[PDB]
Each structure stands twice: as structure tokens, then as C-alpha cells.
Design a protein around this ligand. Sequence first.
Ligand SMILES: CCC[C@@H](C(=O)NCCc1ccc(O)cc1)[N+]1=C([O-])[C@@H]2Cc3ccccc3CN2C(=O)[C@@H]1Cc1ccc(O)cc1
Ligand SMILES: CCC[C@@H](C(=O)NCCc1ccc(O)cc1)[N+]1=C([O-])[C@@H]2Cc3ccccc3CN2C(=O)[C@@H]1Cc1ccc(O)cc1
Ligand SMILES: O=P(O)(O)OC[C@H]1O[C@](O)(CO)[C@@H](O)[C@@H]1O
Ligand SMILES: O=P(O)(O)OC[C@H]1O[C@](O)(CO)[C@@H](O)[C@@H]1O
Ligand SMILES: [Mg+2]
Ligand SMILES: [Mg+2]
Ligand SMILES: [Mg+2]
Ligand SMILES: [Mg+2]
Lengths: 328, 328
Amino acid sequence: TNIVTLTRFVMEEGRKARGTGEMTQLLNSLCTAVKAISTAVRKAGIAHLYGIAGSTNVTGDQVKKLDVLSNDLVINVLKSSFATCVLVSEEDKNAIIVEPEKRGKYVVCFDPLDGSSNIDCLVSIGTIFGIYRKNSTDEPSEKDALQPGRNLVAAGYALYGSATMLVLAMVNGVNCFMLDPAIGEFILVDRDVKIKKKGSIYSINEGYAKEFDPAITEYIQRKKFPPDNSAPYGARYVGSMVADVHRTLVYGGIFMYPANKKSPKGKLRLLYECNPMAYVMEKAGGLATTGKEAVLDIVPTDIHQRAPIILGSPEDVTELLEIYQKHA
Amino acid sequence: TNIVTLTRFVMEEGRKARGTGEMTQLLNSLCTAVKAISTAVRKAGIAHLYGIAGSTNVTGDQVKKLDVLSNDLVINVLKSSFATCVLVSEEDKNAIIVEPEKRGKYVVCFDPLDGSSNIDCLVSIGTIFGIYRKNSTDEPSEKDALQPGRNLVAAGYALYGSATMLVLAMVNGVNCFMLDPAIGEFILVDRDVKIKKKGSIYSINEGYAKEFDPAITEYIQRKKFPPDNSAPYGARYVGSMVADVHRTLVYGGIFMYPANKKSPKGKLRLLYECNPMAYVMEKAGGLATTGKEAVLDIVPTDIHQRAPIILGSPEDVTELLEIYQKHA
Ligand SMILES: CCC[C@@H](C(=O)NCCc1ccc(O)cc1)[N+]1=C([O-])[C@@H]2Cc3ccccc3CN2C(=O)[C@@H]1Cc1ccc(O)cc1
Ligand SMILES: CCC[C@@H](C(=O)NCCc1ccc(O)cc1)[N+]1=C([O-])[C@@H]2Cc3ccccc3CN2C(=O)[C@@H]1Cc1ccc(O)cc1
Ligand SMILES: O=P(O)(O)OC[C@H]1O[C@](O)(CO)[C@@H](O)[C@@H]1O
Ligand SMILES: O=P(O)(O)OC[C@H]1O[C@](O)(CO)[C@@H](O)[C@@H]1O
Ligand SMILES: [Mg+2]
Ligand SMILES: [Mg+2]
Ligand SMILES: [Mg+2]
Ligand SMILES: [Mg+2]
């Protein structure tokens, strides 16, 4: 019929679903935040920090840092949606308990800004989120954050790259929305997205070679030296999970972040990094595993618990799991 | 002292220069070209393409691609400068001779948009440019663009990443200007840029391992298994040269793209990819070699001649060079 906007989409769901509305309000809030973060990432108005209007010689570099500004934007915007009671963020040691006068029936685990190491060099970065409906009637507490990804109602991420895109995964599938920064609307460009069965790119940090387990080690040799004499896979690794996963989703292949010396249980976080992306991958028709068990079925025991993950096209991930059994 | 916009910076170089004012007009052009491309890259107005105003009878004129657009912006904006006579673009099979009624004395080699494999996945991309002064004194010809990079008077790139940055290198140094997209000005944010002596990140597509020469193989192995038992280098490889070289510049380290079987003499182009980055690296106090000789010393015989390239921290690059030496 005609163009579809995130606002419209999040609403059509609301009609169909016939619910309190909370989720639709929560998702609109999210959007409003991703737009603010995006404009800040692109550094709009930076001339004002460098004294274009002067500064009466009194502006020590005490500007709130992008990483911190993102958290503030997400907390406050979600807290104004009236759809949440518990919020977990990478930037906060404890789960944030929402004021009673504004609480809702949802729990959100998020990474306001992922790709920290790439921040100063201008590489793509992003915001990650997974949403859970409360699972009991006890007074709100971190407890509600420890629900397995298997119980996610919605998940996704915002990629601030060459352009800004919001990928949202819900029970019925995955959709990609492109931010039109000129009017501030996320336009739907890819509907019910599905990952490729087998890709041709593998992504992982090889500087950890000396610490890889026998399975990872074997797998890598295969991509470079195909036992069946097939074309070796190309290698890509941005260093920003949102960016690597996003490419995995749209181009195919596999992305790996396993255990190594300093990261026995892996590095990536379960609540706000592994789970959202795993849900996104599965909802898009791909796999996401620790190498041994599926990421969504893990029962988190701490809000900043780390987990090893491997995700991407089915066959690519299957083959690596194949190798893991071989070594078991 | 106060804010410095690239425009202010380019006008003052000129004053000192005491010349025709042509370089200034040229850099002005480039800037305008860069800002428009950045705006296109970020997808402003995309709502219109998706019917926000209804059927726009758009047909035969299949929408214009970012790559074609960018080239057209750069080709047009440069001609308007009245400061050039020969343009070499990756997108053009032949050097563009500027019509007589618009001829300036400069030759420019550029890549309107680099990292084309990262376009559809929203990964950082950029524009690379290298500028020359007409060597001869006879009718403008492709030959004029066939000069070693040592002859460059100005070179750099516009990186369309999380934020847009234009890096400009000239005889007296390298300067970084952040694009404030709200007013269309580039703000100098890092003056007299120097790369670090030793890094801790290497950047190469290992999917070609099977085809690497013995030196690359040895050096790579040494990065993961530091014979000095120190911490191994972290790995990063975005896939877009600009993003990758840019990271190298601000964090230090080493970027590589040697020759492989399908790429007998490397993949990257000497004129609009390698030379400009080689130039930036040397002005920043870093090195750039093919493995046998300095990139800038090479004399071109084909405007689309490719070449292998190793750039970054001098210590890391020299380490690799001594390995080539040893294996000789
Ligand atoms: C895009 C950033 C805008 C930013 C700003 O810093 N402007 C200063 C000049 C400038 C403009 C663009 C740019 O890229 C760099 C510097 N800004 C505004 O322009 C207007 C000003 C204003 C004045 C009165 C009442 C409300 C507002 C709203 N309003 C804003 O809320 C912000 C912040 C602001 C507000 C008041 C000021 O005196 C200076 C800045
Ligand atoms: C940021 C895109 C701007 C772009 C556009 O696509 N506008 C359509 C509406 C829209 C707005 C925002 C958006 O994100 C998507 C679609 N645009 C303008 O808004 C104004 C319109 C105009 C009208 C009369 C005379 C001059 C201009 C200049 N002018 C422009 O040159 C461009 C292109 C344009 C011009 C005239 C039109 O009828 C439609 C589009
Ligand atoms: O440098 P490393 O150990 O490869 O870490 C990479 C990862 O770090 C993260 O920033 C998370 O901390 C991810 O976004 C990225 O995948
Ligand atoms: O797929 P490859 O072999 O890594 O090619 C990547 C290189 O090619 C380019 O896209 C140029 O064609 C560079 O931006 C990049 O580094
Ligand atoms: Mg973070
Ligand atoms: Mg993160
Ligand atoms: Mg190009
Ligand atoms: Mg290129």
C-alpha cells in the first residue's frame, strides 16, 4: 500500500495484539533514544565544544563522554515510557529499580554503547537490547533480569555505521529499519529477514590464537585450508560486536568470541550482548551457541555474567559444533 | 586562538603560499564534495525513495547508487574548482582531462568511495584523494597522473564512520578535522598527527593464509606467539582500507594487504589507494612499503596499476621488512 515507519509498525502490532499498550510505548521510547544517540555519535554541534562561540577561556575537557551520555539517554527515555520496572545496563553494577509511580511490566537489559575500543578511531558502534516481561509478583529486583533469553518478547540493536539502522526481532520475525536522519523516522527496508544457510566469511580475533581451544583451532584451519579443496573464507573483524553480527546477519557466515586466557567463560556479556544477538540470529533462522549448548537456554546467575558465543549461518555453526563433538 | 575550520586552515596555508590561490579553491571543492557524500552515505531523504509522498513515477531512471553518486559529486565539484586539469578515478577506465575552459594546474587521483564490500552491511567506508601539480608544460594527458607519490603536494581521506572525519596531509604534517554535520564545517581536532612507534594490533585478511609469502606467514605467527613471550597483538580488520588505515594512524600498529594468487601484485591501487595512505603515513612519521620498496618511490605506468602494501608504526613495519630481508 505504502511506506511503513517504525512508529507505524510498532503500532500495527499493538492493534493486532490488543494489549495494555506498554510495549508500543516502550519501543517508541527506545527509538526516540536511538535517534538522540545517533545524532551524538555523528557528533552534531561539536563546533560548540571547540569554541565557535568563544568560551571565555573556561571549558576544561569535562564534557560528559559519549559512553556515559548514551546510558543517560537510554535510562531516562525508557524510564519515561512507564513500561518498565527493572533495567540492566553494562554501565551499572546493579540492576536499576524503577520508581513505583512509573513502573511497567517489562525488564530491559541493554548496552547503551557497544564497541568501546572502536569509539576513538571512529569505527561503527551500537546500542544493544533485549526485553523481558516480568515473571512474577515479587517486589521488583535484579531477580527479573536473570531470565533466559528463551523468554525474550523482543530484542535488537541499533547500528551507528556508514548509516544508522535499527534491527528489531520479535516472536514473528526480524525487520530492518533505516533511520532517515533528515526527518527522524526509521523506514522499513528489509521485511522478515532470514540469514543465509552457509556464508563465506568467518569473524573472530585471531590475536588470541595461542589461547584457542582445539575446536576453534581446527575450525579456523578449515576456512583457510579447505580439506575438501573448496574456496577459503574471507576474514572480517571490526572489533565491534554490533557491526560484526550485523554483517553476519546480512551477508552470512559466522562470528566467534570463545574462551581464552583472560576470558575463561568468554568475554561477551550474557544479558545484554549474547542473548539479544542470539535471539536475533535464531529469529532470523540461524544458530547461536557456546560451542556446547545454545545461548538462549542458559540460566544466567549474575547480571554481568560473561558467556562464550558462536553465531551465524546454520551450516557454518553446525560444522563448528560438529568439530566440538569430535573433541568430546 | 580559537576554533579552526578546515576552510580557515586552507585559506591560511594559501596566504603563506603566496600563489594563484588554486589549491585553496581545490580543497574548498573537496570539502563540499565530502559533506554531500557524507550526507548521502548517512541516507538522508531515504523516506522519499520508500514512498512517503507516494508513487514518484520513478522508473527507467533506476535510482542512482551511492558509488556512482559519489564519483559524480567529486568529478563535478573538482571541475568547478578551476584548479585541476587531470582527474583519475577508480571508477573511470581513463584519466579525465578537464576541458580547457576550466583547467587548473593540479592533477588529482581519487577513490570516490572505498570499502565497497562494506556498503550493504553499513560498515565504515570513505573517500581517498591524492593531489599532484602538473609536472610537464604540454597538453594534459594521462601521463601527468603517472607520477611517484613522492611528488604529492596534498593527500588524504574522508572517513564516513560513526562520525565523519577528513584527514589531510601536506608537506608540513598531518591534520584531522571532525565534520560537524549540523553546520557543515570541519573542525580541526588533532593537530600535527604523529603515529606511534610500536603498535599492538595487526590488520590483514587471513583468509588468504594459504597464499601468503613466507615472510607474512612468519610475521603473523610472531604476532600470535610473541617469541619474547610478551602479550600477543590484538587483531582488527574492518574490510575497508580507510577505516583500517585510519585506526592504524590513531592507535598505531600495522595494516597489510600483500599479494596473493588472484592478486599477483597486490589488490589495492597505487594511485588513489596506496600512494595517498603511504603519504599520510610518512607525514605522520610512519612507513609504507610493498615489502621490497617504498610505495612512494614507485613510478607508475598504468593509472590502475595495483601494488602490495604494508603500512603503520615504523617499528612494526621494519620488523616485517627485516624478515623479508632475512629470507633474502
Ligand atoms: C546543533 C547544536 C545546537 C546547540 C548549540 O550548541 N548551538 C550553538 C551554536 C552552534 C550551532 C550549531 C553547531 O553545529 C555548533 C554550534 N543548541 C542550539 O543551537 C540552540 C540555541 C538555543 C537558544 C535559545 C533557546 C533555545 C535554544 C535551543 N538550542 C539548544 O538547545 C542547543 C544547545 C545550546 C543552547 C543555547 C546556547 O546558547 C548554546 C547551545
Ligand atoms: C531530506 C530530503 C529533502 C528532499 C526531499 O526528498 N523532499 C521530499 C520530502 C521528504 C523530506 C524529508 C525526507 O527525509 C524525505 C522526504 N528535498 C526537499 O525536501 C526540498 C523540497 C523542495 C520543494 C520545492 C523547491 C525546492 C525544494 C528543495 N528540496 C530538495 O531539493 C530536495 C529534493 C526534492 C525537491 C522537490 C520535491 O518536490 C521533492 C524532493
Ligand atoms: O578486542 P576483543 O577481545 O576482540 O573484544 C571484541 C569485543 O569487545 C566488545 O566491545 C565487547 O566488550 C564487542 O563489541 C567486541 O566484539
Ligand atoms: O576482501 P579483501 O580482499 O579484504 O579486500 C578488501 C580491500 O578491498 C577494498 O575494498 C578496495 O577494493 C579496500 O577498502 C579493502 O581493504
Ligand atoms: Mg557499553
Ligand atoms: Mg558491548
Ligand atoms: Mg570507488
Ligand atoms: Mg578503494
